[PDB]
Amino acid sequence: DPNHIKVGVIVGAEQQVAEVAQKVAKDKYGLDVELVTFNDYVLPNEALSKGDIDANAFQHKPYLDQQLKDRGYKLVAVGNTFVYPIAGYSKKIKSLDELQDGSQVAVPNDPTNLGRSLLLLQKVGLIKLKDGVGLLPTVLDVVENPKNLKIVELEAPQLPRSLDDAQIALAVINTTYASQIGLTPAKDGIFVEDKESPYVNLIVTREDNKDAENVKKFVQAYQSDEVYEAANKVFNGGAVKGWLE
């Protein structure tokens, strides 16, 4: 079907935003966009690589690059979407003043979002990392940890439910999944990453279909004021436009 494109997205608020892009694509081009929904960060790139979908819209470039290295995919970015500054959340404390020694702190376990989380924990002064780590520090790079915090690495989609675990005092959670239980950085975050970061999300395709006319249309539909306005609402200001104005 030459007027049909399948795009992989994550359930929750990101799916809602993608639905607006779907609408713009229909209204502006009469393009038939099908959203294929996922609730993890691994299967969407598998689906794309295998040709089960044409594009996906869920990852930032460090993540993409790591996926190319680790899985050997031939994928490429065809457009920016939003930066989603990541936040630390808790259902046990309201401030770092209350963080007890020995507390478990949950973070994503994939290399780039793990690194990102550790950099955030360093930024707010809870830990110090070795020099030269760049974007990919690991827990082995922690050189100061005065509260003797225990970093608990979890699959990203598990981070929202981790908040209810009896020992998890703090969790760094992608807004993707935080939004599934109605949390946003501005409303619920104890601390939040700077808007300026390398983590703008992407629309990604295979090398072989990066220039497909339907891909170009979808990118233009997503990169629209209508989509921004929707994102800014549902993410309560936690979505920064990543494309050229």
**Cα–Cα dist 74/49, whole Å:** 7
Nearest to ligand MET of 214, 238 (CB atom) = 238
Among 59, 66, 197, 223, binds ligand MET (CB under 6 A): 59
Among 60, 87, 178, 189, binds ligand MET (CB under 6 A): 60
Which C-beta is closer to ligand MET: that of 31 or that of 84? Answer: 84
Name the pairing type of β-strands 240-241 and 55-60.
Answer: unpaired
**Site map for ligand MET, 61-100, x if CB under 6 A?**
--x--------------------x-x--------------
Region binding ligand MET by CB under 6 A among candidate stretches 29-37, 87-95, 163-171, 174-182: 174-182
Q: Please give the Cα distance from 89 to 86 (Å, whole number).
A: 10
CB 105 within 8 Å of CB 151:
yes
- Least distance CB 113 / ligand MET (angstroms): 6
Interface residue with ligand MET among 176, 197, 205, 214 (CB under 6 A) is 176
The arrangement of strands across the sheet holding 4-10 comes to 32-38, 4-10, 55-60, 201-206, 75-80
- Smallest distance from the beta carbon of 76 to ligand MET, in angstroms? 16
Stretch binding ligand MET (CB under 6 A), from 99-107, 170-178, 189-197, 209-217:
170-178
- H/E stretch holding 211: none
Indicate which single residue of 73, 191, 199, 228 sits in contact with ligand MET (rule: CB under 6 A): 199
Dist CA 116 CA 139 (whole Å):
12
Q: Is the dihedral of CA 37, 42, 45, 49 positive or negative?
A: negative
How many residues of this chain bind ligand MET (CB under 6 A)?
13
Binding status of residue 201 toward ligand MET by CB under 6 A: yes
Decide: 59 and 201 in contact? Cβ < 8 Å.
Answer: yes
Site for ligand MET, residues 116 to 145, rule: CB under 6 A: none
Q: Which residues contact 241 (CB under 8 A, 6 or more apart)?
A: 82, 228
Q: Among 41, 89, 222, 228, which residue interacts with ligand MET (rule: CB under 6 A)? A: 41
Q: End-to-end CA distance of the chain: give it in Å, rounded.
A: 32
Per CB under 6 A, residues contacting ligand MET are 41, 58-60, 63, 84, 86, 113, 174-176, 199, 201
